Amino acid sequence: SKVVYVSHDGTRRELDVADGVSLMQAAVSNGIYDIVGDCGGSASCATCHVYVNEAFTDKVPAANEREIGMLECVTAELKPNSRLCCQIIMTPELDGIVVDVPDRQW
Numbered sequence: 001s002k003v004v005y006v007s008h009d010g011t012r013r014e015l016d017v018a019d020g021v022s023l024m025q026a027a028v029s030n031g032i033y034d035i036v037g038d039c040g041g042s043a044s045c046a047t048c049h050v051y052v053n054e055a056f057t058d059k060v061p062a063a064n065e066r067e068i069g070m071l072e073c074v075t076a077e078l079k080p081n082s083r084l085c086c087q088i089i090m091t092p093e094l095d096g097i098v099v100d101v102p103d104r105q106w
């Protein structure tokens with residue numbers, strides 16, 4: 001799947017994430033996950049605070065109730081379609097997904 005990561009400084013990094021892989025898995029491989037995953041990707045923290053283009057949020061597997069509670073624990077401003085990276089599974093059909101990462105993810 002074509003995955004685009006929009007950093008805070010504006011630098012964009014695009015990777016290929018295979019089916020069943022989490023945007024978090026491909027990030028650690030392209031040097032993008034340097035967000036110090038607290039739960040280590042076990043979906044138990046809010047360090048993976050990112051913004052998924054509202055166009056893939058209602059398409060990729062609806063975030064689980066564990067993310068909603070961790071989403072209220074983020075350090076930056078939440079968005080109506082705000083999402084995390086360790087609870088989303090990429091797929092070829094959803095290729096073109098745009099992920100927006102802020103300057104405050106803690």
Ligand code: FES
Nearest residue numbers: 039044045048086
């Ligand atoms: S990396 Fe910990 S909740 Fe996503």
